[PDB]
Amino acid sequence: EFHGPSWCLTPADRGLCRANENRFYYNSVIGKCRPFKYSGCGGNENNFTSKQECLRACKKG
């Protein structure tokens, strides 16, 4: 059904810069966006800052 992009089901990038942030990662198992300590610079393009945007993007309802 979906084309299958390459940045919504990728593993949460957490290993590059050195900053203890808090981005919302979309879990492909439960579907809910679980916040994770994002390193910072470098990583995939799925680093959300809120939860309403994470669901409105990969879920789109």
Curated annotation (Swiss-Prot):
<protein>
    <recommendedName>
        <fullName>Tissue factor pathway inhibitor</fullName>
    </recommendedName>
</protein>
<comment type="function">
    <text>Inhibits factor X (X(a)) directly and, in a Xa-dependent way, inhibits VIIa/tissue factor activity, presumably by forming a quaternary Xa/LACI/VIIa/TF complex. It possesses an antithrombotic action and also the ability to associate with lipoproteins in plasma.</text>
</comment>
<feature type="disulfide bond">
    <location>
        <begin position="33"/>
        <end position="54"/>
    </location>
</feature>
<feature type="disulfide bond">
    <location>
        <begin position="8"/>
        <end position="58"/>
    </location>
</feature>
<feature type="site" description="Not glycosylated">
    <location>
        <position position="47"/>
    </location>
</feature>
<feature type="site" description="Reactive bond">
    <location>
        <begin position="18"/>
        <end position="19"/>
    </location>
</feature>
<feature type="domain" description="BPTI/Kunitz inhibitor 3">
    <location>
        <begin position="8"/>
        <end position="58"/>
    </location>
</feature>
<feature type="disulfide bond">
    <location>
        <begin position="17"/>
        <end position="41"/>
    </location>
</feature>
